[PDB]
PDB file of C-alpha atoms and ligand atoms in Angstrom:
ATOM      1  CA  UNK T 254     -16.674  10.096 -51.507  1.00  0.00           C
ATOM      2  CA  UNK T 255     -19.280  12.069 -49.749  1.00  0.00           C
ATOM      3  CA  UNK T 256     -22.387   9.804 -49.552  1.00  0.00           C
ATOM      4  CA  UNK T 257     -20.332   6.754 -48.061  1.00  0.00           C
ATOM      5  CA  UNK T 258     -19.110   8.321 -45.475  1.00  0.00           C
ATOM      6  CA  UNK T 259     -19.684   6.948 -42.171  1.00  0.00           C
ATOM      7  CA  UNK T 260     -19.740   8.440 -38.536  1.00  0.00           C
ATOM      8  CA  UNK T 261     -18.487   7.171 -35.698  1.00  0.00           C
ATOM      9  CA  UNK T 262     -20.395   5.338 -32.990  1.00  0.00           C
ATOM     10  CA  UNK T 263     -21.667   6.444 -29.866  1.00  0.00           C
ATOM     11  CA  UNK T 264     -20.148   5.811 -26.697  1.00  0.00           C
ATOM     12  CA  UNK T 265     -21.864   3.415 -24.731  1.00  0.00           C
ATOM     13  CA  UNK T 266     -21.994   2.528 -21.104  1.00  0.00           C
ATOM     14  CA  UNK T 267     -21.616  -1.342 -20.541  1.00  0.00           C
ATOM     15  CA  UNK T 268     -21.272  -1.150 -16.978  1.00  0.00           C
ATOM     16  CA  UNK T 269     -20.471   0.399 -13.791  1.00  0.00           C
ATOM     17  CA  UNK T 270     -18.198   0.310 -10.734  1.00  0.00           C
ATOM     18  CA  UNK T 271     -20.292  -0.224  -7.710  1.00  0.00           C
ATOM     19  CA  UNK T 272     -19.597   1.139  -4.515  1.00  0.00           C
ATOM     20  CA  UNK T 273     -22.423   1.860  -2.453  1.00  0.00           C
ATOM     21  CA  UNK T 274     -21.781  -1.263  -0.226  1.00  0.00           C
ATOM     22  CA  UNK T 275     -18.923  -2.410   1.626  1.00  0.00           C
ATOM     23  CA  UNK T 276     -17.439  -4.270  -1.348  1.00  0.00           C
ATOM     24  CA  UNK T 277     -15.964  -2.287  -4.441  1.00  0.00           C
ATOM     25  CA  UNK T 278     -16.622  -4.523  -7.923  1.00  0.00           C
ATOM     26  CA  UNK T 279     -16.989  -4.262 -11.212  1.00  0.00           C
ATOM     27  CA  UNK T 280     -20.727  -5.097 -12.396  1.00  0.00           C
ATOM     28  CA  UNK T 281     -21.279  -5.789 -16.585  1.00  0.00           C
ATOM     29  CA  UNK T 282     -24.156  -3.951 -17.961  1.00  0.00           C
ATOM     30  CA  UNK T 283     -24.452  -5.112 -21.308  1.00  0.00           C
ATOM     31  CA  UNK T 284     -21.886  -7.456 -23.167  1.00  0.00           C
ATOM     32  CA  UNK T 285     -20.400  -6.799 -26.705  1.00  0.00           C
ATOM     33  CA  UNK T 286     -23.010  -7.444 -29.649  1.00  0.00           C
ATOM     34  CA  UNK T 287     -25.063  -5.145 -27.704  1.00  0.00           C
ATOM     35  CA  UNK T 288     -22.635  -2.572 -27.013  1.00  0.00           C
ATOM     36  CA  UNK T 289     -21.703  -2.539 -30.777  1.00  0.00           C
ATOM     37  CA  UNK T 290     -25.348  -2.070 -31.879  1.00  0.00           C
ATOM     38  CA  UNK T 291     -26.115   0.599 -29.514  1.00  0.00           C
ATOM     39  CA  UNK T 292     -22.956   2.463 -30.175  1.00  0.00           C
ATOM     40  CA  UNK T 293     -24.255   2.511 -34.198  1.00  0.00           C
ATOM     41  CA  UNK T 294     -27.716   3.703 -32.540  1.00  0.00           C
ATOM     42  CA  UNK T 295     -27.247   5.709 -29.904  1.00  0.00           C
ATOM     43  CA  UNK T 296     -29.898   4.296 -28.320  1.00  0.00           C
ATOM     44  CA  UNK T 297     -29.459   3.125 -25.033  1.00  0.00           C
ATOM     45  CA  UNK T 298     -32.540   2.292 -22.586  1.00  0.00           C
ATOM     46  CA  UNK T 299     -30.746   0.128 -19.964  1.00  0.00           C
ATOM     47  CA  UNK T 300     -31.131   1.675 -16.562  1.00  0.00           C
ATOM     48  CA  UNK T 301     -28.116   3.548 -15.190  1.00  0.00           C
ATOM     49  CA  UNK T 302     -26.818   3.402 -11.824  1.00  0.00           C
ATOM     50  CA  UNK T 303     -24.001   4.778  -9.542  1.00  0.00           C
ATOM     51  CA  UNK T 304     -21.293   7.609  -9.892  1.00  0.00           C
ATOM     52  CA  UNK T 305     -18.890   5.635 -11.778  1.00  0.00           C
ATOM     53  CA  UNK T 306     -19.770   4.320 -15.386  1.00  0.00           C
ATOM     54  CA  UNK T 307     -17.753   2.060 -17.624  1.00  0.00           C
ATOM     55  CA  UNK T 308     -17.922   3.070 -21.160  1.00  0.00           C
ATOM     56  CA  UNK T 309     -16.495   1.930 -24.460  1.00  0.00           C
ATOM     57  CA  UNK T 310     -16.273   2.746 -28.232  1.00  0.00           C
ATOM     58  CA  UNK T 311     -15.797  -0.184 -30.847  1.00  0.00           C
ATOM     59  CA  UNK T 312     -12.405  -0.324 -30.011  1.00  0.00           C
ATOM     60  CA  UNK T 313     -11.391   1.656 -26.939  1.00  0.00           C
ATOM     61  CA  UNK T 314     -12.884   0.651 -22.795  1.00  0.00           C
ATOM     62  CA  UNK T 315     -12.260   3.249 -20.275  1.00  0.00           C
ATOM     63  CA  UNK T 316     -14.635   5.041 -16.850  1.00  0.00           C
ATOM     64  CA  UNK T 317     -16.556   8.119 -16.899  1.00  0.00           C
ATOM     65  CA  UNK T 318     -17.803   9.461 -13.828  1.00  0.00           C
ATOM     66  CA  UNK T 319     -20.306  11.842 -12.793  1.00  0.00           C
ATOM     67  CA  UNK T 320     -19.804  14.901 -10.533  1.00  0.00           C
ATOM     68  CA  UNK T 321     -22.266  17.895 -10.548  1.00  0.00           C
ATOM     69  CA  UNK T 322     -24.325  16.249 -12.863  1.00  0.00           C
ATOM     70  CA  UNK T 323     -22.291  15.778 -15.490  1.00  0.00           C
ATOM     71  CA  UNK T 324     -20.925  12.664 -16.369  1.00  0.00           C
ATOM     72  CA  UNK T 325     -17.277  13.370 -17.120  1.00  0.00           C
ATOM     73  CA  UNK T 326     -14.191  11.720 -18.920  1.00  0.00           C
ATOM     74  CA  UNK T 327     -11.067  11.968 -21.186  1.00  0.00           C
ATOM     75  CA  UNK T 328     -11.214  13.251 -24.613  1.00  0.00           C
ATOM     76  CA  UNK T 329      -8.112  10.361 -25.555  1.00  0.00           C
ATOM     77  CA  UNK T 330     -11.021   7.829 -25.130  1.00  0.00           C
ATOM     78  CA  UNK T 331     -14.237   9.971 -26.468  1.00  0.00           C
ATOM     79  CA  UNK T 332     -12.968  12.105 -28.713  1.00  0.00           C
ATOM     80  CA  UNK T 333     -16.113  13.975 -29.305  1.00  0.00           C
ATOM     81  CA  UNK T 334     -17.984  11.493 -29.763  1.00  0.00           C
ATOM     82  CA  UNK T 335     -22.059  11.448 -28.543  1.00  0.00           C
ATOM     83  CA  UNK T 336     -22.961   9.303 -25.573  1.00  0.00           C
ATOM     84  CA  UNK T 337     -25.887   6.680 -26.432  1.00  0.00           C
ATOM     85  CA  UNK T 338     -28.910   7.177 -24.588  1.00  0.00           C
ATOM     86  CA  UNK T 339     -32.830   6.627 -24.195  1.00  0.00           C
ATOM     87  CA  UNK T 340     -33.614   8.879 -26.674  1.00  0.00           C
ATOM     88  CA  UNK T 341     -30.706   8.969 -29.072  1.00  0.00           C
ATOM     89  CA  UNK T 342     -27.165  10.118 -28.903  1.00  0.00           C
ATOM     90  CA  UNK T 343     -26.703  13.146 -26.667  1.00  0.00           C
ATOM     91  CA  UNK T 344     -23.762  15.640 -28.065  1.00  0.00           C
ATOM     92  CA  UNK T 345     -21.206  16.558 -25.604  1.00  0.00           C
ATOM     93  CA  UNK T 346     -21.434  19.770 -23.580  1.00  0.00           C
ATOM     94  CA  UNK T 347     -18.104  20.350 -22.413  1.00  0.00           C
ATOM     95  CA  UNK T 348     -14.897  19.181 -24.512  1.00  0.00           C
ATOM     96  CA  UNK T 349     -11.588  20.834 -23.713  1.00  0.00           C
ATOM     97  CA  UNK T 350      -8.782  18.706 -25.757  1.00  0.00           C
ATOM     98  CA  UNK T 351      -5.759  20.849 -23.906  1.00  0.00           C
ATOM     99  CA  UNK T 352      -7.050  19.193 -21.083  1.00  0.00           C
ATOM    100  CA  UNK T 353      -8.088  16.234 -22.255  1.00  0.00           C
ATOM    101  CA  UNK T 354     -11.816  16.276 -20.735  1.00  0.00           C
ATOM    102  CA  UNK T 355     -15.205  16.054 -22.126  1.00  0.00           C
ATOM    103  CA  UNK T 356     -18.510  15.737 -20.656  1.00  0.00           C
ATOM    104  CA  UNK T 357     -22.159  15.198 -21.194  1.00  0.00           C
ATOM    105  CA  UNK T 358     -25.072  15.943 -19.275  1.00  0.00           C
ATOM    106  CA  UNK T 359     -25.280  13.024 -16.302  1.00  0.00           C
ATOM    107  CA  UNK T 360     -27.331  10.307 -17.249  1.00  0.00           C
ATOM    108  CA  UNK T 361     -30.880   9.705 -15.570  1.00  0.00           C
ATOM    109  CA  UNK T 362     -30.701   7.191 -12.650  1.00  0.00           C
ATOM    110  CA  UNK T 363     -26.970   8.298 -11.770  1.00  0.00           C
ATOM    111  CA  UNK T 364     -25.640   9.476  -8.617  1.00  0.00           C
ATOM    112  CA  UNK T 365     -23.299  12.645  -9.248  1.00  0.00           C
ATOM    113  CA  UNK T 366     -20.141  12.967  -6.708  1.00  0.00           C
ATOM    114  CA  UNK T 367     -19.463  16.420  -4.431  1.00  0.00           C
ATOM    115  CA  UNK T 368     -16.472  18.272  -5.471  1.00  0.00           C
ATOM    116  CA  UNK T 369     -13.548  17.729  -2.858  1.00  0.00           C
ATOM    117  CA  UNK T 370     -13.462  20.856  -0.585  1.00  0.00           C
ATOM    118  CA  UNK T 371     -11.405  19.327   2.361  1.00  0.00           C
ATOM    119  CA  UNK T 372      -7.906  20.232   0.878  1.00  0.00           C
ATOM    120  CA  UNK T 373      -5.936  16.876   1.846  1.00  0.00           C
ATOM    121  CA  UNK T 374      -3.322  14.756   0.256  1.00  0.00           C
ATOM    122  CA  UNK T 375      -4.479  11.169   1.405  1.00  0.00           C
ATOM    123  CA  UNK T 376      -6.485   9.953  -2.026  1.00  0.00           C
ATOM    124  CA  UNK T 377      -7.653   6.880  -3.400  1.00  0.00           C
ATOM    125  CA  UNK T 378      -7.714   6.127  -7.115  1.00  0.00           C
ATOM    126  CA  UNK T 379     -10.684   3.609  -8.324  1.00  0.00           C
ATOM    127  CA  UNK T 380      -9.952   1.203 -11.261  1.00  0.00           C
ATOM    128  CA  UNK T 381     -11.721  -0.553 -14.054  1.00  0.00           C
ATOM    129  CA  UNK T 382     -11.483  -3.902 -11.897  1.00  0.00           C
ATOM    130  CA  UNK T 383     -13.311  -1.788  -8.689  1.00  0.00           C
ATOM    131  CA  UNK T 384      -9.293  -1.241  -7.012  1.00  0.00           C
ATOM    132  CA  UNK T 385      -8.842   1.095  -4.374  1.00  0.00           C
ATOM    133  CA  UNK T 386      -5.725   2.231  -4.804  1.00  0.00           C
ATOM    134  CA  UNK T 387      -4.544   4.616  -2.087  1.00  0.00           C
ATOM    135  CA  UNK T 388      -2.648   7.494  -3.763  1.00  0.00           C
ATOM    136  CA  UNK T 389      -0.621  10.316  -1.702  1.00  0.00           C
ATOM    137  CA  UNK T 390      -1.329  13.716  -3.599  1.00  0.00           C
ATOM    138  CA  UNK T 391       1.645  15.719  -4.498  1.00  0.00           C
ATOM    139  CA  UNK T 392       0.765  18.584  -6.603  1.00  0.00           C
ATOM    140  CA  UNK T 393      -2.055  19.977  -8.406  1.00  0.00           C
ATOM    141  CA  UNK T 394      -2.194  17.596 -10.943  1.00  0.00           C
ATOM    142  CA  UNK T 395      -0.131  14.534  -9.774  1.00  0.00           C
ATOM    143  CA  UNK T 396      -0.124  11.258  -6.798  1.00  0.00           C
ATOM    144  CA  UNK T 397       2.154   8.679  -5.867  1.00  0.00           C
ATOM    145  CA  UNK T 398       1.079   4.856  -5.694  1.00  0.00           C
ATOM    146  CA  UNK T 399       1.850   4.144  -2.235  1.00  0.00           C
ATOM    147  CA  UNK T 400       1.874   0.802  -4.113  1.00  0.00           C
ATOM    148  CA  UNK T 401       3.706   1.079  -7.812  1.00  0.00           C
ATOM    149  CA  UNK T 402       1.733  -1.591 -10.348  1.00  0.00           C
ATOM    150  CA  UNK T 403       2.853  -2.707 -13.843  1.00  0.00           C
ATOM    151  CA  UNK T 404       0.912  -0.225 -16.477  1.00  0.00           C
ATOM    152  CA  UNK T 405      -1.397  -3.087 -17.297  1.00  0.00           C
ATOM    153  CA  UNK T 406      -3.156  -2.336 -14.012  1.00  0.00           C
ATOM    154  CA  UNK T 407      -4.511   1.046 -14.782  1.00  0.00           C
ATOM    155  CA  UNK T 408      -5.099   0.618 -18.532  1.00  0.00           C
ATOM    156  CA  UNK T 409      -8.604   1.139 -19.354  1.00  0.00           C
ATOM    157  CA  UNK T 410      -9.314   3.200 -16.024  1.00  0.00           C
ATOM    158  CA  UNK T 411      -8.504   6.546 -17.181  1.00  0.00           C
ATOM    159  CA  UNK T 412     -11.710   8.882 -16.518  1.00  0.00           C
ATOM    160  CA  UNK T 413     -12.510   7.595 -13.676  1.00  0.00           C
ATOM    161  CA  UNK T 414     -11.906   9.223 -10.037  1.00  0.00           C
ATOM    162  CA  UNK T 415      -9.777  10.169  -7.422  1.00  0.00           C
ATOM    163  CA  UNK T 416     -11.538  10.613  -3.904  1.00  0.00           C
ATOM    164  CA  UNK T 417     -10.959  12.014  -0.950  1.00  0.00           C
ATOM    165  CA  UNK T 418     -11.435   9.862   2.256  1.00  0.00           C
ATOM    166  CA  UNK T 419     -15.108  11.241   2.430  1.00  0.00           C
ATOM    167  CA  UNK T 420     -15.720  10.460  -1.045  1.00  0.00           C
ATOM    168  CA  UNK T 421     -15.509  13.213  -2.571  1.00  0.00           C
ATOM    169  CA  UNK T 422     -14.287  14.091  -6.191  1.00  0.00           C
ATOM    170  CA  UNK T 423     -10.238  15.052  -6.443  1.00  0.00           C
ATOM    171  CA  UNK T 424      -9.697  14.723  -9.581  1.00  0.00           C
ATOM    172  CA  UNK T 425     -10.215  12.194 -13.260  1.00  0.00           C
ATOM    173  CA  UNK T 426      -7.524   9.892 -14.050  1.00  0.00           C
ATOM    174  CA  UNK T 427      -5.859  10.946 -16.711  1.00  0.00           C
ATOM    175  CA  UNK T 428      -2.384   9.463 -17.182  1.00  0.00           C
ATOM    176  CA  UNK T 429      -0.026   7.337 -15.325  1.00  0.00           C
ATOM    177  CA  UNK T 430       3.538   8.373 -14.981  1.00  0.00           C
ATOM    178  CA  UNK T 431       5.779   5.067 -15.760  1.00  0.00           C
ATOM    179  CA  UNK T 432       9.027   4.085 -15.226  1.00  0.00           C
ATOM    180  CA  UNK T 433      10.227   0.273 -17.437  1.00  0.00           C
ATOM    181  CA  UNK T 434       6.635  -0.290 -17.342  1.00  0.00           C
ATOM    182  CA  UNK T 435       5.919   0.513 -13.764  1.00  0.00           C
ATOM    183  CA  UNK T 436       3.764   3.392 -12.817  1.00  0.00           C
ATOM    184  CA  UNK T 437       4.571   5.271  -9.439  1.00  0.00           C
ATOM    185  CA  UNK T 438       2.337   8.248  -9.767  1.00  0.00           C
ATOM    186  CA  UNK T 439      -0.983   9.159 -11.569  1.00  0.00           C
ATOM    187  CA  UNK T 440      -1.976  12.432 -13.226  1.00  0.00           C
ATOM    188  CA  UNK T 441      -4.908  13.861 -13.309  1.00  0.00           C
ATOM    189  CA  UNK T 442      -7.531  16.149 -13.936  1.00  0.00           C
ATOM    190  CA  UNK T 443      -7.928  18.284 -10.847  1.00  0.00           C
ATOM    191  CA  UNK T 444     -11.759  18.754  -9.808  1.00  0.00           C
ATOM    192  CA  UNK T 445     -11.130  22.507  -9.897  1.00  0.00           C
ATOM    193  CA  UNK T 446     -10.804  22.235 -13.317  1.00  0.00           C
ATOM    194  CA  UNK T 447     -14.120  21.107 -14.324  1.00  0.00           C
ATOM    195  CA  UNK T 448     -15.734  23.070 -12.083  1.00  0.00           C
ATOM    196  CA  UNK T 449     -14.097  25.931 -13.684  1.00  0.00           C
ATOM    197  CA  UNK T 450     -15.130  24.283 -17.290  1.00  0.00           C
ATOM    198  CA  UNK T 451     -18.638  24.042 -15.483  1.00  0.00           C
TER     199      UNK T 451
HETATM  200  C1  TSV M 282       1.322  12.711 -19.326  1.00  0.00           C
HETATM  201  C2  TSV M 282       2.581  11.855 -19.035  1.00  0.00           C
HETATM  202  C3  TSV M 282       3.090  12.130 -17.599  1.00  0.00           C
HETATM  203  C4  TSV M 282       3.689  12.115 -20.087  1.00  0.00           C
HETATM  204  O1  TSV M 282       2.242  10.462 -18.995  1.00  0.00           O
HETATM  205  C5  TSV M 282       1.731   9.849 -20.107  1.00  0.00           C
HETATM  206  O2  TSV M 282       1.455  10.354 -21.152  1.00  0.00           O
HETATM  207  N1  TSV M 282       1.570   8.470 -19.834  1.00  0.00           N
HETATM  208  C6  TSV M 282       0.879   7.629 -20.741  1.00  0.00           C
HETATM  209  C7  TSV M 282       1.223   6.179 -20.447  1.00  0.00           C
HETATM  210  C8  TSV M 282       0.472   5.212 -21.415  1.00  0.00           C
HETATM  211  C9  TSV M 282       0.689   3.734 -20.981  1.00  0.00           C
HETATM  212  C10 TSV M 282      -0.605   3.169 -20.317  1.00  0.00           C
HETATM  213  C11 TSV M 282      -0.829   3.816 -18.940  1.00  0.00           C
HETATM  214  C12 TSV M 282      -2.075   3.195 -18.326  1.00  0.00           C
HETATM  215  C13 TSV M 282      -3.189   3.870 -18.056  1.00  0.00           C
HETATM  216  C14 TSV M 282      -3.472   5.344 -18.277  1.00  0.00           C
HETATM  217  C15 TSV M 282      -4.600   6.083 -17.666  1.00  0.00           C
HETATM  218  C16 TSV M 282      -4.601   5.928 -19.162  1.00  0.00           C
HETATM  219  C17 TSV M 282      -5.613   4.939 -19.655  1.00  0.00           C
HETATM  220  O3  TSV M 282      -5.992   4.002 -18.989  1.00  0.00           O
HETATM  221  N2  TSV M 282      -6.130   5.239 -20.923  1.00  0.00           N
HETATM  222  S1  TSV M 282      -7.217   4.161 -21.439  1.00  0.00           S
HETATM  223  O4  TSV M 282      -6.565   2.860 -21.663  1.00  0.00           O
HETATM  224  O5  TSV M 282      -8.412   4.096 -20.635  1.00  0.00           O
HETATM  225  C18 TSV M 282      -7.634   4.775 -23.038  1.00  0.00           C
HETATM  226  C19 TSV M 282      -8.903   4.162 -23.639  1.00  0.00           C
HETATM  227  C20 TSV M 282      -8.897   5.608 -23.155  1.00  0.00           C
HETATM  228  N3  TSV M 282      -4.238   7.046 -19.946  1.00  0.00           N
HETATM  229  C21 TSV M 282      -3.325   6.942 -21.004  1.00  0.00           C
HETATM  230  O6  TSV M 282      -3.014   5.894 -21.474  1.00  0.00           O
HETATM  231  C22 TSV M 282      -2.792   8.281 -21.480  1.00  0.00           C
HETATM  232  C23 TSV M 282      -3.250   8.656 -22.942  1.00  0.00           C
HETATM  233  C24 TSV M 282      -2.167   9.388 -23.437  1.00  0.00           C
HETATM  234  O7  TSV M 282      -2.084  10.709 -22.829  1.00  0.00           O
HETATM  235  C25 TSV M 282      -2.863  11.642 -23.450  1.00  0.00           C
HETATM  236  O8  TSV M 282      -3.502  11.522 -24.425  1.00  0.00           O
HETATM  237  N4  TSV M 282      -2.803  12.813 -22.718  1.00  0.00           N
HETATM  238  C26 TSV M 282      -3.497  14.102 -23.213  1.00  0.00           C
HETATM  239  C27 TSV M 282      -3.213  15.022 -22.213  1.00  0.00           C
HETATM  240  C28 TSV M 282      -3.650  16.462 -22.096  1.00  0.00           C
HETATM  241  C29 TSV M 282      -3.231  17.243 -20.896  1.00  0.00           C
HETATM  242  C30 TSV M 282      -2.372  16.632 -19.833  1.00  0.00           C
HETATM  243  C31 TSV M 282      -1.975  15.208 -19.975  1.00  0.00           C
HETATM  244  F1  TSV M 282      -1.243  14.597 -19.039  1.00  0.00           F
HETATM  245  C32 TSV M 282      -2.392  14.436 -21.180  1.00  0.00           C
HETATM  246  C33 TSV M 282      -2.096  12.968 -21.525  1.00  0.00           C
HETATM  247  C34 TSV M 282      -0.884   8.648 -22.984  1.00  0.00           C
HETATM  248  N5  TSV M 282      -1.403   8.209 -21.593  1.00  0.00           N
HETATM  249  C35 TSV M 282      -0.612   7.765 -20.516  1.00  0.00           C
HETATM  250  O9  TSV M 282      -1.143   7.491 -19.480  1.00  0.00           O
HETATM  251 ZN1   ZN M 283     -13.132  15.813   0.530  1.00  0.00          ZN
END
């Protein structure tokens, strides 16, 4: 009935991929209790850093990851939900469900990536555990594993990016393409896309 209704949470960044060194990992922002409380909230003053976030609702983890100052990721994991922040929960500004993309304006303290303008196949995909996963592009939309990996490897990673060998932004990982569990090839959202959206 109406006045028990709830809404959903927030989504909530817990942590982020670092790769400004020579060493790609996986840093932990906040841990769970915290993450729960702030996704009721929406508030969220922890200092942000770095292009790629990792971001969860109360029951789904996945990447989001900022390019052109918007910090970008898959409606399958957001839905449209707000994104917890200093001030309260900021509502989406882009959400496109046929492509499975939403957005919110880039949190302060990130660091957005360049849009790929170099037109080459030789990518790398960047997982949830801080993988670099070399990828060989083969459409608009779609890369090979030069490496295939059980599904369990890439769960949890979708929304977060494709690069270029100068770092740039390709594309957001948006499905992988398995075989009896095994994934050979990635799709994703192409760059182009949400710059278009943008
Ligand atoms: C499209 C094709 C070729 C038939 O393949 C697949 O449908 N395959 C499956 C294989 C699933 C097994 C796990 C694979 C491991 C990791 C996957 C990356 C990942 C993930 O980590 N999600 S998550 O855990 O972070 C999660 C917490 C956020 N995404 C998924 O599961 C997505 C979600 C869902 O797809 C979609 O809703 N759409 C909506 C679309 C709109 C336009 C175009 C599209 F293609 C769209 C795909 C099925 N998905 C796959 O990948
Ligand atoms: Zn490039």
């Amino acid at each position: 009935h109406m006045a028990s209704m709830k809404k959903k949470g927030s989504v909530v960044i817990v942590g982020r991929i670092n790769l400004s060194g020579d060493t790609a990992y996986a840093q932990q922002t906040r841990g769970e209790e915290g993450c729960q409380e702030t996704s009721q909230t929406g508030r969220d003053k922890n200092q942000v850093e770095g292009e790629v976030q990792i971001v969860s609702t109360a029951t789904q983890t996945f990447l989001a990851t900022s390019i052109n100052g918007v910090l970008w990721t898959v409606h399958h994991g957001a839905g449209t939900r707000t994104i917890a922040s200093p001030k309260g929960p900021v509502t989406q500004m882009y959400t496109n469900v046929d492509k499975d993309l939403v957005g919110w304006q880039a949190p302060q303290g990130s660091r957005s990536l360049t849009p790929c303008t170099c037109g080459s196949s030789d990518l790398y995909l960047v997982t949830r555990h801080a993988d670099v996963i070399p990828v060989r592009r083969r459409g608009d939309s779609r890369g090979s594993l030069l490496s295939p990996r059980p599904i369990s490897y890439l769960k949890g990673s979708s929304g977060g990016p494709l690069l270029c060998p100068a770092g740039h932004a390709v594309g957001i990982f948006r499905a992988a393409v398995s075989t009896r569990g095994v994934a050979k090839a990635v799709d994703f959202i192409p760059v182009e896309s949400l710059e278009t959206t943008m």
